[PDB]
Write a protein that binds this DNA or RNA. Structure first.
Ligand SMILES: [Mn+2]
Ligand SMILES: [Mn+2]
Ligand SMILES: [Mn+2]
Length: 430
DNA sequence: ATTATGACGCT
DNA sequence: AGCGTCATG
């Protein structure tokens, strides 16, 4: 009753750029705007691998992970932009720099947690309190929410998309008790007003469109963000969770799309998140562990406590390249040359990071895959990172991995290497 | 032969 | 520390 906590204390948003790398290329090249287009890495093998797809191209069935030659079978007029190549490898600097543009705008509204190159969580609880005390009981006008969907509405007793959006928003705003400065539904609504302002600022100042979710925690905000893309935002209220989850496949919730979610489905004999409510917390902990079990028990009721961490910058800076098949590295000269290429890119990114962010990495992690190993990383080893020098970094990486060469001769490398990875970690204030 | 990352949990 | 899982631009 009055003591069963409901996880409605916070207002959390998730802002995610629409087809981010495509928008970066469309800003640069106006000929790609409002076109089916995709961004690719490399070109020789099957036209390159697609990593981002405009919504026009998605309508034709084009997806990430598709080879461009196959995409062109679905969409013959598909336009392609290629990721820059530097030192023999894909270079994603343009998109990291665009990401920083967006993150700096978001940070003007609230402290953010960078979750990926194109998305960030926002804790809006305090900004919402401020805007509410500024409003002093004045209701919220639909005009302040021009791109907002209210999940679950309209309901109860026009055949256009925008018309339904407005119908749902009108039902929501009529139901609102705008006199209660502590009503969670009102708090979410003001949160959505702020997120409209943040998304307007991002588009005005960068040209980039985004979507967003507003709810009481990170998982619901992420899920909400996906419900109405592109260029829209969605409010998922605490009350909307039972209906939403009653037909939600377990795999759609962040962290359940892999082996654990498959085991929830198989062990419990269920398919939808709502079905988790029938198990006790101890039952779920017995199957899935203390932490997972408690998390599932609360999450299926809409409750999750993971904080929005104050972290705008990545914790690690890394450089990786695969060498599939005939391109696998089979000589020590090859291995050394590619370690040097990766280390030169790493040095350049690290030096810029130290100037921009007043910090230095102190640990170098070297990861490799040997041909014939199914695991994505065959071996991972750390060493000290004491100088931002690519030649020293690559020599140290070689020292750390040279024991893996099973070749009797030192000129050859066996089994050949199918991936190299250098990662700088353990940052300290400079 | 989706590839280039990056966060985080486990032991 | 090194390995596994999850996400996916
Ligand atoms: Mn996105
Ligand atoms: Mn994203
Ligand atoms: Mn995506």
């Amino acid at each position: 009753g009055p003591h069963m906590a409901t996880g409605q204390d916070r207002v959390v948003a998730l802002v995610d750029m629409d087809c981010f790398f495509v928008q970066v290329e469309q800003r640069q090249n106006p000929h790609l705007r409002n076109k089916p287009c995709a961004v690719v890495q490399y070109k020789s093998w099957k036209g390159g691998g697609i990593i981002a797809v405009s919504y026009e191209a998605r309508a034709f069935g084009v997806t990430r992970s598709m080879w461009a030659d196959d995409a062109k079978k679905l969409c013959p007029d598909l336009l392609l932009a290629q990721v820059r190549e530097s030192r023999g490898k894909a270079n994603l600097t343009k998109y990291r720099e665009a990401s920083v543009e967006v993150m700096e705008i978001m940070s003007r509204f609230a402290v953010i947690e960078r979750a990926s190159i194109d998305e960030a969580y926002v804790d809006l609880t305090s900004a919402v309190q401020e805007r509410l005390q500024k409003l002093q009981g004045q209701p919220i006008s639909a005009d302040l929410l021009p791109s907002t969907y209210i999940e679950g509405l309209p309901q109860g007793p026009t055949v256009q998309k925008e018309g339904m959006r407005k119908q749902g928003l009108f039902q929501w705003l009529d139901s609102l008790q705008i006199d209660n400065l502590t009503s969670p539904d009102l708090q979410l609504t003001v949160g959505a007003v702020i997120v409209e302002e943040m998304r307007a600022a991002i588009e005005r100042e960068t040209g980039f469109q985004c979507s967003a979710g507003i709810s009481h925690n990170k998982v619901l905000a992420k899920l909400a963000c996906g419900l109405n893309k592109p260029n829209r935002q969605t409010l998922v209220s605490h009350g909307s969770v039972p209906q939403l989850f009653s037909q939600m496949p377990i795999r759609k919730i962040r962290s359940l799309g892999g082996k654990l979610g498959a085991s929830v489905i198989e062990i419990l004999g269920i398919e939808y998140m709502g079905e988790l409510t029938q198990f006790t917390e101890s039952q779920l902990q017995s199957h899935f562990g203390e932490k997972n079990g408690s998390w599932l028990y609360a999450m299926c009721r809409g409750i999750e406590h993971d904080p929005v961490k104050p972290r705008q910058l990545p914790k690690t800076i890394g450089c990786s390249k695969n060498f599939p098949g005939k391109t696998a590295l089979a000589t020590r000269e090859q291995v050394q040359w590619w370690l040097l290429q990766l280390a030169q890119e790493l040095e350049e990114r690290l030096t810029k990071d130290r100037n921009d962010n007043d910090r230095v990495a102190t640990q170098l992690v070297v990861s490799i895959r040997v041909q014939g190993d199914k695991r994505l990383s065959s071996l991972r080893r750390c060493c000290a990172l004491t100088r931002y020098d690519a030649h020293k970094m690559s020599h140290d990486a070689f020292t750390v991995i040279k024991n893996c060469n099973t070749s009797g001769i030192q000129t050859e490398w066996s089994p050949p290497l199918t991936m190299l990875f250098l990662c700088a970690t353990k940052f300290s204030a400079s």
